[PDB]
């Protein structure tokens, strides 16, 4: 199994934290977050999404773990109506498709 893990994934988790602003509550829902949590996470940080986000991530991947690959991050981001974001992470998934460069 690879050793380092804060690589390409950095753009997938740093993205969720880069734009934020109702950006996480979108991936959070899609990642399988219930309303009892968004309401909780939101309370834990009423004026700090950058922190509440890191909270789902602990759960977010807890469910799609095996399906929480880089593609899951960007692929999921798109469902959050956040293409501009998903687009920069799309580069994340391109980190390897860039060798031959062949996306959509």
Q: Distance (Å, rounded) from C-alpha 32 to C-alpha 40?
A: 15
- Identify how the structure was determined: NMR
Q: Three-class SS of residue 80?
A: coil
**Angle value at C-alpha 62, between 36 and 4, nearest 5 degrees:** 140
Q: Which domain holds residue 26?
A: 1-104
Q: What CATH number is associated with residue 63?
A: 1.10.533.10
Q: How many domains does the chain have?
A: 1
Q: After which residues is the chain broken (C to N over 2.5 A)?
A: none
Q: Distance (Å, rounded) from C-alpha 7 to C-alpha 33?
A: 25
């Amino acid at each position: 199994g690879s050793h380092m893990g804060e690589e390409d994934l950095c753009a997938a988790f740093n993205v969720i934290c880069d734009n934020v602003g109702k950006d996480w509550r979108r991936l959070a829902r899609q990642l399988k977050v219930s309303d009892t949590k968004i309401d909780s996470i939101e309370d834990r940080y009423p004026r700090n999404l950058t922190e509440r986000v890191r909270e789902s991530l602990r759960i977010w991947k807890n469910t799609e773990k095996e399906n929480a690959t880089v593609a899951h991050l960007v692929g999921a981001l798109r469902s959050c109506q956040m293409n501009l974001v998903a687009d920069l992470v799309q580069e994340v998934q391109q980190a390897r498709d860039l060798q031959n460069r062949s996306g959509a």
